[PDB]
Amino acid sequence: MQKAVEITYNGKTLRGMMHLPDDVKGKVPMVIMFHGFTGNKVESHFIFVKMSRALEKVGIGSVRFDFYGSGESDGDFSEMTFSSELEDARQILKFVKEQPTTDPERIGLLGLSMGGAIAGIVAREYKDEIKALVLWAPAFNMPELIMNESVKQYGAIMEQLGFVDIGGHKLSKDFVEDISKLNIFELSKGYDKKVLIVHGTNDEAVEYKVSDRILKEVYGDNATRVTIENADHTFKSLEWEKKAIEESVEFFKKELLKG
Amino acid sequence: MQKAVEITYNGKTLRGMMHLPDDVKGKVPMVIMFHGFTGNKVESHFIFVKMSRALEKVGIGSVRFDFYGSGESDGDFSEMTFSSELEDARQILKFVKEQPTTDPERIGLLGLSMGGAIAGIVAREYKDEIKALVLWAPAFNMPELIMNESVKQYGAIMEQLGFVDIGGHKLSKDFVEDISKLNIFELSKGYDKKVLIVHGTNDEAVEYKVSDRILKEVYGDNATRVTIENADHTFKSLEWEKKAIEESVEFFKKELLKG
Ligand SMILES: CCCCCCCC/C=C/CCCCCCCC(=O)OC[C@H](O)CO
Ligand SMILES: [Cl-]
């Protein structure tokens, strides 16, 4: 079953979707999904919706919200910063924990690109109550990625405008200042539960090498990678998408359902 | 006021968003918005969401649903045809008509790309009860767009797969067969109320010349085109989407609010 849900906090309203298994009523495992930069809760070629329905089938529920300033949620994109999305995330996890259908023992996190960076930080911040973590092409190098564009053109354009057009989105000065001061690798360092990284070798938004760094610097043996040969950033093909979803569902099955 | 809404018919659930102007009294004008091919109700850089909020501020309400097979709604893309989206649209119109807050005499349609083809056909079908029509990069040439693509490669792939992968979506043989049978130009002919066409000269998905054909063939002097120079398909810049939205709202303001 699928229903729209809301969260209202600090005069901000977040809008999202909630899934629960049909044939398994009771208290269930839940996966929270965080979308990427300029993405939304449906995500690229509806891959998050597909993921929710795949989890539903094996008895795991999920929620996925639009961050403030994105998609269906309140706010202008120019009001959003990484930190503001981090705050959204905490409010989202709280929402999940308070559902009478939520098994508070078996809660997992999933994030794509910048949403993957959110997930890593949230997972660690709550390491004692997040049972598993899946990272899709995690943009742990986001601050660096953004800082480079700043020196290339953003800095110059922002100096003059206070923002930059990144394609029908007003990216504000406050975003670049906020994220320049953050290090995602470090804020994710220290999560001990199971971790799945899924990444396409041919990713051109978040280079595949970023996942090497994460395995090395951030997690130990608890982290495993699923490499998808030739795949682009959001796994933009039926078989790339199928692989990413099945591996992630299998992983969440083993980690959230058993014992 | 923004709230999630739901339609069900023939075992299909459509999920959408509804906007109403805050505490204006009694029934209000409504704009129904149809998203494009592989798009969803949020649409490119949230332009539909932005269009909805801009309409709300001038006292015009709106609804935006995901077509069956897309976004948050039920179904896989493989089940969708142009005709099934037409049927969705008829159910969405009915839904809007039967809301207590709807002024039945002031309903307008807006459609992007293939959603524009939908709106054009629906506008004609209900020409006596659709007050105004707005078309964004209307893909009235969708049949030949696909048929070109079909004869090139689809046949062999279709036979053994039943679909082709258009990038994380199953485009079915049924879609191709169904669309070949339609003439959106002829099906849209005869809508005699006001029409606004907004189209970018650098549209790489629906070539600007299609709008020429539509003005020449489909409508009379009741149709007007706003040309956005250099813009791509979904007006992917701050200035372009602003112009598309504002011209569209002004048009709807003029057509829906007084006469
Ligand atoms: C390789 C992927 C990027 C990796 C690095 C981080 C990028 C973060 C944001 C990038 C948006 C880049 C494209 C921005 C395009 C803006 C176009 C625009 O402003 O208007 C449209 C057109 O240029 C007429 O004006
Ligand atoms: Cl929604």
Residue numbers in the entry:
A (entry chain B), B (entry chain A): 1 to 259
Authors' own words:
Lipases are enzymes that reversibly catalyze the hydrolysis and synthesis of a large variety of glycerol esters. Different from most other lipases, in which the lid is generally formed by a bundle of α-helices, in Tth MAG lipase this domain is compact. It is formed by two small α-helices, followed by a β-hairpin and an additional α-helix, referred to as α-helix/β-hairpin/α-helix (HBH).
In the active site of both Tth MAG lipase structures, with and without PMSF, we observed literally identical density of a glycerol molecule, presenting one of the two final products of esterase/lipase catalysis. The glycerol molecule tightly interacts via its two C2 and C3 hydroxyl groups with the carboxylate group of a non-conserved active-site residue Glu43, specific to Tth MAG lipase. In the presence of the C18 MAG reaction intermediate, there are significant alterations in the packing arrangement of several residues within the lid core when comparing to the PMSF-inhibited structure. The largest spatial deviations are found in the N-terminal part of the lid domain, which includes the first two lid helices α-LA and α-LB. In the Tth MAG lipase ternary complex structure these two helices are separated by a short loop, whereas in the PMSF-inhibited structure both merge into one long helix (residues 142–161) with a sharp kink at residue Gln153.
